[PDB]
């Protein structure tokens, strides 16, 4: 149709942090439409892609992807913690990531 979305839109918000020390190995993601840790248990283990563009073409593409996955939930309001194979570059604070429905259970 006009839409081909097979992922759920998210936002790369922050690293895991205290007041004055951040942890780049964990990133906090706001899944759209999730407002509860009990709602957010559906998405645990789902693969996150951060899809971004470049100028050098490497393997027949100017689009590069960073792959990761939801690991657990964060807080009371549906934020989840995610880990990526290479950590998200921190200029993407506020950028949109893609939360795919696989590995699916229901």
């Amino acid at each position: 149709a006009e839409s081909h979305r097979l992922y759920v839109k998210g936002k790369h918000l922050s690293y895991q942090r205290s007041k004055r020390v951040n942890n780049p190995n964990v990133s906090l993601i706001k899944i759209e439409g999730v407002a509860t840790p009990q709602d957010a248990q559906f998405y645990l283990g789902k693969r996150i892609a951060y899809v971004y563009r470049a100028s050098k073409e490497v393997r027949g593409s100017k689009i590069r992807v960073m792959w990761g996955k939801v690991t657990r939930t964060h807080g009371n309001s549906g934020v989840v913690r995610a880990t990526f194979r290479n950590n998200l570059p921190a200029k993407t604070f506020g950028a949109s990531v893609r939360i795919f429905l696989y590995p699916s259970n229901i």
Binding site: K11, L13, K30, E32, F93, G94, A95, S96
Partner: protein, 197 residues
């Protein structure tokens, strides 16, 4: 969810709105706030006027052009409140502030777009009835802002044309809704009602 979110600032409390907008900007949402002359601050007008005069009285002594810049327009009071809620000296907080536009009244393009409200910041939802509040338009014209009567002339013009729009829009939604009720009692429309639609 929208690419930009357009907030009607009328009847909102200024710091409850500015904390909502500041979190939204740093989350990557673009926000334009209109009608910043009809923002509200809790407390009596005199109460809030002394607060500006205490802010007005601080400036760099050896060069008054280096000090705090006491911006007088209601959109800039709200921009000041939203600054200090954003790490505005870092590149991330500069980029967050680029995601924000603030206006007095409802200028173009936004005069023909949908305006949202923030019920976490709404005055009639958050303040106790019987309290006293100030409107940011009346505060700003007492601290040195020059365009209250111009915006009130432009908004009154804006509401005349916008009422003609909605008067046509009511007439079309008579024609539509009376057709949908007449297209009810159809075997499709009994079958859509089974599916909850």
């Amino acid at each position: 969810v929208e690419p930009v979110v357009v907030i009607d600032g009328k009847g909102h409390l200024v710091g409850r709105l500015a904390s909502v907008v500041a979190k939204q900007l740093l989350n990557g949402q673009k926000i334009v706030v209109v009608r910043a002359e009809e923002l509200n601050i809790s407390g009596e007008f005199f109460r809030n006027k002394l607060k500006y005069h205490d802010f007005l009285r601080k400036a760099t002594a050896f060069n008054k052009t280096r000090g705090p810049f006491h911006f007088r327009a209601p959109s800039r009071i709200f921009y000041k409140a939203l600054r200090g809620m954003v790490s505005h000296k870092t590149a991330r907080g500069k980029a967050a502030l680029e995601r924000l536009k603030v206006f007095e009244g409802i200028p173009p393009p936004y005069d023909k777009k949908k305006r949202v409200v923030v019920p976490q910041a709404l005055r009639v939802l958050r303040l106790k009835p019987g309290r006293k509040y100030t409107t940011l338009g009346k505060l700003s014209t007492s601290v040195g802002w020059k365009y209250e009567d111009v915006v009130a002339k432009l908004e009154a013009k804006r509401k005349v044309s916008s009422a003609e729009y909605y008067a046509k829009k009511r007439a079309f939604t008579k024609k539509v809704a009376s057709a949908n009720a007449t297209a009810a009692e159809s075997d499709v429309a009994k079958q859509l009602a089974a599916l909850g639609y």
